Amino acid sequence: KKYSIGLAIGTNSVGWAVITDEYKVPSKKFKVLGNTDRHSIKKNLIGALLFDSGETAEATRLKRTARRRYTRRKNRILYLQEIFSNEMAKVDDSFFHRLEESFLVEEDKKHERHPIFGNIVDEVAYHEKYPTIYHLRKKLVDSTDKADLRLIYLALAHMIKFRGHFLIEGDLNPDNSDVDKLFIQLVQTYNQLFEENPINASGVDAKAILSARLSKSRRLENLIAQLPGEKKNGLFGNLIALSLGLTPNFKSNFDLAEDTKLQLSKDTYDDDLDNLLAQIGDQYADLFLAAKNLSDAILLSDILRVNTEITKAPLSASMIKLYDEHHQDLTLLKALVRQQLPEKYKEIFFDQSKNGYAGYIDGGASQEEFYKFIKPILEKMDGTEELLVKLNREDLLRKQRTFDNGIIPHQIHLGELHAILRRQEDFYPFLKDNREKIEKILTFRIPYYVGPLARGNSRFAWMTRKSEETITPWNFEKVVDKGASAQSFIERMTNFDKNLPNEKVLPKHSLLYEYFTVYNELTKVKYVTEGMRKPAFLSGDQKKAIVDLLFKTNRKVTVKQLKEDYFKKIEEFDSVEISGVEDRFNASLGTYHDLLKIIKDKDFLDNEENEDILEDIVLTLTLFEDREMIEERLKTYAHLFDDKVMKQLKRRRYTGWGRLSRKLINGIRDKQSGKTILDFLKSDGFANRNFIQLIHDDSLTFKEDIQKAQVSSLHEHIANLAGSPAIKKGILQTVKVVDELVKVMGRHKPENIVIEMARQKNSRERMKRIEEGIKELGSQILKEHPVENTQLQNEKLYLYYLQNGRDMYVDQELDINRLSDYDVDAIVPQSFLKDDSIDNKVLTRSDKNRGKSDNVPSEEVVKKMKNYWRQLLNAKLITQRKFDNLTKAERGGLSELDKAGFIKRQLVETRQITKHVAQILDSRMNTKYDENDKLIREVKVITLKSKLVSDFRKDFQFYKVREINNYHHAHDAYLNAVVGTALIKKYPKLESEFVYGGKATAKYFFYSNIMNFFKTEIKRPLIETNGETGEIVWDKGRDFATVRKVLSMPQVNIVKKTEVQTGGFSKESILPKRNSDKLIARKKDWDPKKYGGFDSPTVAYSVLVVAKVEKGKSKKLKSVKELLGITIMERSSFEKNPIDFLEAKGYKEVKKDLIIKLPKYSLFELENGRKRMLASAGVLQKGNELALPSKYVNFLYLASHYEKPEDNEQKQLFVEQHKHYLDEIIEQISEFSKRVILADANLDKVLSAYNKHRDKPIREQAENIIHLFTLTNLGAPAAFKYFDTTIDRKRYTSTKEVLDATLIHQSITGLYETRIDLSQLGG
RNA sequence: AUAACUCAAUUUGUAAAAAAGUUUUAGAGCUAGAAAUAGCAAGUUAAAAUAAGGCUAGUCCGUUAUCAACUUGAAAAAGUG
DNA sequence: CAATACCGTTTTTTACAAATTGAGTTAT
DNA sequence: AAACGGTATTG
Secondary structure: OOOEEEEEEOOOEEEEEEEOOOOOOOEEEEEEEEOOOOOEEEEEOEEEEEOOOOOOOHHHHHHHHHHHHHHHHHHHHHHHHHHHHHHHHHHOOOHHHHHHOOOOOHHHOOOOOOOOOOOHHHHHHHHHHOOOHHHHHHHHHHOOOOOOHHHHHHHHHHHHHOOOEOOOOOOOOOOOOOOOOHHHHHHHHHHHHOOOOOOOOOOOOHHHHOOOOOOHHHHHHHHHHOOOOOOOOOHHHHHHHHHHOOOOOOHHHHOOOOOOOOOOOOOHHHHHHHHHHHHHOHHHOOOOOOOOOOOOHHHHOOOOOOOHHHOOOHHHHHHHHHHHHHHHHHHHHHHHHHOOOOOOHHHHHHOOOOOOHHHHHOOOOOHHHHHHHHHHHHHOOOOOOHHHHHHHHOOOOOOOOOHHHHHOEHHHHHHHHHHHHHHHOOOOHHHHHOHHHHHHHHHOOOOOOOOOOOOOOOOOOOOOEOOOOOOOOOOHHHHEOHHHHHHHHHHOOOOEOOOOOOOEOOEOOOHHHHHHHHHHHHOOOEEEOOOOOOOEEOOHHHHHHHHHHHHOOOOOOEHHHHHHHHHOOOOOOOOOEEEOOOOEOOOOOHHHHHHHHHOOOHHHHHOHHHHHHHHHHHHHHHHOOOHHHHHHHHHHHOOOOOHHHHHHHOOOOOOOEOOOOHHHHHOOEOOOOOOEHHHHHHOOOOOOOOHHHHHOOOOOOHHHHHHHHOOOOHHHHHHOOOOOHHHHHHHHHHHHHHHHHHHHOOOOOOOEEEEEEOOOOHHHHHHHHHHHHHHHHOOOHHHHOOOOHHHOOOHHHHHHHHOOOEOOOOOOEOOOOOHHHOEEEEOOOOOOOOOOOOOOEEEEOOHHHHOOOOOOOOHHHHHHHHHHHHHHHOOOOOOHHHHHHHHHHHHOOOOHHHHHHHHHHOOOOOOHHHHHHHHHHHHHHOOEEOOOOOEEOOOEEEEOOOHHHHHHHHHHOOOOOHHHOOHHHHHHHHHHHHHHHHHHHHOHHHHHHHEEOOHHHHHHHHHHHHHHHHOOOOOOOOEEEOOOOOOEEEEOOOHHHHHHHHHOOOOOEEEEOOEOOOOOOEOOOOEOOOOOOOOEOOOOOOOHHHHOEEOOEOEEEEEEEEEEEEEOOOOEEEEEEEEEEEEOOOHHHHHHOHHHHHHHOOOEOOOHHHOEEEOEOOEEEOOOOOEEEEEEOOEEEEOOOOOOOHHHHHHHHHHHOOOOOOHHHHHHHHHHHOOOHHHHHHHHHHHHHHHHHOOHHHHHHHHHHHHHOOOOOHHHHHHHHHHHHHHHOOEOOOOEEEOOEEEOOOOEOOOHHHHOOEEEEEOOOOOOEEEEEHHHOOO
16 A cells, blocks of 8 residues: 655656555556557556756847847848938939848849949949948048948948947047157156156157057066066056056055955946055055056057057058058968969969868858968968068958957947048038937947837836837937836846835845844844853943944954954953954945945934935945936935035945845834834843844734735746756656656555756866966966866866966975876865865875865964965965865864764755755645644655765665666666665654754764664664664565665666757758758748758657658659658648648648657657657657666676775676676677667677677776667667777668557656557558 | 855846858959860958748747647646556 | 768857855844 | 757768
8 A cells, every 4th residue: 555756856867666665666557548459568666757958048048139139230220221211312212222132143133233333333443442341431531522322321331230349438539649658658657756766768669569469468578678677567567557457466566455456447446546545645646647548548559550640540440451461461472372382372272171361261261270271381481471470460361350350349430430420411411410310320229227128028028118109219218218117127136025025125235234234243242351240242322332433434343343442442341252253243334334435424324314315325326237327316315415425426336135125124013112123133121132033032023913914836836946947847847757656556645755866168267267367376387388278177187277286285386297196185075075076176296295084184284385275265266165175274173063064964965956846745745734724744755865875776786887778767766765765764863854844973973874774784683673663674684685676677667758849940050052952041032042041950840641642744642651840940830720731742632630749759669679769750769778687787887897895805706707797798789789779780890899809808898888888778879989999870760660660658657658550540 | 944144156037239150142353265174363341131930010029948648728737547 | 772971150248136055143 | 068860972
């Protein structure tokens, strides 16, 4: 009767198992529906659902936002053409049409094929005169002549279409007129102060050096080499760093506290410089106001590098510089190939397949791939000197439109747009009148805090209209309510107070929130001095004075400040011992001081009468980050403040939200006392009750008034947990298998459910970690030992680099060729913490350098290495967490309680995600109440970590080999049920920890020995029992036999979740034209034989069609049965009307009643038990699991790791004994592969390989057998190696055989099947 | 197990922007040759598209999540061994 | 028909909220 | 980032 369920919850599977009293897995007879002659079947109640990962919403979002970018850029051009429409119609009334049809081949074009002037002589003339658009852009900026309107339009349209970035705020004029002197205005402002060590400027060419072909980083070095007696990280070299753009320490420059890096482009900087200047005095911001005055020209230099006082179009002129240089260098490279290498010219200048010029210009070859190719050639010939200077500088044969124009800000483009408009407005009255309109098309940008400009058909939209009517760059302010919209952008994402759930949380930085924060910490500080019996609470008055004197004067108050500045001076004690605060108060009045600095007067802060004004100011400063909108919402308090001060508040932005509301903190009243929570936190007699105390006090009304304010789908519930969509898919399925297992078990609930649930890009972030950390350390280790990204995925090499080539425990340089002789020691030993992260790993010469094994590293070490752990910490080359764990011995180290804590974590699952899954299953199984209206827990939900079954597997030789088949998930769920239920039968004490719903030494020994009742020796007995109840928990000499027998059962229900495919219509590669039915038109009228198009559409699902086709001149109707793949693009027109769709495909007399949907993984059974899974309309997958006997699984396990005491005698002697298990396994793979795989040629290749490698070691043959299973695995054929032989995938490239096979519709567990024979439909 | 605070690190979800890439056309190829083909010249730029599309017609929406079969249901889901 | 092999859009920036993990403080 | 279905090309 009684039973339990076991579950193993992964991202790609749910393992499940039903067990009874004696840890047995029952079997039953299940109906078999359908049209076959089998009416029923025996099944074991063990199984696994397999499924493809749920994906994140990201890909979908980056597509969505780019789509919106595309539609808006189109609108940008359509705004400009609409302005030009009238006057364009008088110059050339087909001009906008010829442009829209530029894509179409001549035979589909309505107008003459030359787009700009609609004839060949004028178009050839345009290109000879304006080889690039930048040549035209410069001309229209500088020239004063009336221009052709078409030419005007094309220059503005290109600037509006490719308009650059919105990263810099406000206005940009090119100033490169005085980099030869701005530099020497700052050499003199710095040479007045440091008049006792003056810098020889020697009219040195700063114009060149700072702003060369080369970088910023280097360009500093090269300037400071040209200055005798100046450390390149000295005060002038530090300033000069900034004037480029880098963050120096500035710390030793002036010998202060911590590090005072700046950055002239960050907004922090106006306000930040007086953080350094309010240390060294206002007398030194003429050395920074001469170092902003060059922070300009250095900004623009790397793009522009053309004298700006001879063109208002420095950008286009720079582009023309690349065009001319490209022209010269190529006529030269051509001469120098002809005179010195002429046999190669065709390859370099005609062959597109090869990454020469032909490849660069007309093939698929990149600037990098081109440069890589001809460096050999260009140096394998003299004369090519100055050409190679450029190749190394990435200045050689540059295109104008390239990866690096990313840096160009929209303000540069706007400069030329403005210029051109000022020129031609003199001739074109419409341009003068619409100059501001046009400039606005380039400039306008929907604010991120407004979002889609929707009309309540966008699930993503939130913006509000003042006016129902079309939004435009021009009417935007008058029609969008930017304020309402900026607020919703935040409010629609923010929390409500969990205790008063209709009240919204306060801004984290609210003065009231911070008062709450401080008083809560402060009302539990307790002190003791001279002749006081015990330590006591602070009082009301005491807290007021401590708040008033200390908290309202310094960001941090320290325990020292509370001893020396308070108790010493007002309470007059010589020594005071305080408890509840260590070092400094976590809470602080951050906003109080921020606001004191900007509004001078403290009486205004301290005056309660105007608390509401002050809360609304910070709410404004939190809600918005647009200083305009701040200023607009702040000007209502401009009556109560100076001019100077509104310019300072306008700047004081804040970020973050509380967990609590104003109402809860300081509105709601204890009925009795009439006091708010904050009221109590300020003064609560001699009780000094906490926030969380007051919430839970029966003596007070807060507990029930909160109860009053409280308020009450599965799919919804799950999808709204915090966790990876991948793991959320596993969760929903496990809930659906549990629901099925209850139905099969007669709607009877289980006794218990035992869940356990598993734990270039990686290599580009690491390289970023490495580069930035060494830059911060200033270490030449990279020049000494250079590294490609992808070899930093070696754990020893990455740790070597993150350690600056040093032993992390000794202060000795590590030799980079000896990593082999070096240990990777865990910081917290693995014996306590199962963490394989870089966060708890370190590289050392000898692991023993750490100190003793049984703790965190030695104080001796910590003492000697510390200053070194904090260089790496300040460099991001370790995290605070690694740092805190390295140093821990100086704070005492690992307490016996700490160690016991960790041994518990290894067995007790604490992750919030797995707890919710338990809670869901508890709430769903336990729904019943008693006479007294108490919840009846009819079902215990039990949570294990994976270590328990992994240990139990290793400890009793129930080895998993993952790659034999999919059974191990099922197996794990079974072993969870048995270890689960057994464990709380032996120790009902542990329900505390495992069931939802000298004292450290004992705990420690207890949990590390908890699992001993399974073992016969450690002297303890066969039958094992519950002390109090006298229940049998484990027949140690029979219960292991039932576990061996269950794991041996060949018939385990494995189910691949069948799925309709969704996603991109096809691959995205826009292919060239080819004659081929495969190409898919990128638009209705673009025949892919003329225009190219898409390849490879995804089939959403396949559909069995029985119909007729026409054959012959005759069109005699011929019967067909086959699968047609319905593509994601097609699916919706196929569903609107199945018939019409198939009839358009060539089908007749379609039998509509035999159309079967066949989603991906649809399972078919053929001859001899052979099964196939549908991959697609014309591709199948391996649908069988190979049930290898357990004696072979174990042999493969141990064999494959001879790297395993007197226990390893029996282990290595079992392998050597049963070496003939090798042949017996090869034979099991071939009998399987011959009856079900049908890869005749691939089998011969594995057999020849096996027999050829027989004299090789057993270990090495077993590792290689484990590869051979990929031959046999369920799913898509895939390549594997045998030793050195590669066996390429034998693929199933037709679905015809399944048309006459048996379709098997499986329920989620596999227990219920509907079997269809398809030989019984096709006429 | 749970709440607030502090510090660090993660993960999820949203919006606003940028630069390329690719595709077709445009940018008169020249000269010998009956042609097959052979010499030389040339190249850096632009337009337009960037899921087909959709109706709600917005400067919106269009790749996430959810899916055995049978009956019921627009669906969500429920009933069926 | 089978064996064989090739291919696959990419980078970057700004603004924000939430939950989570894990080292501290105070509590239910 | 592979993995593995689309595609062509080869007899």
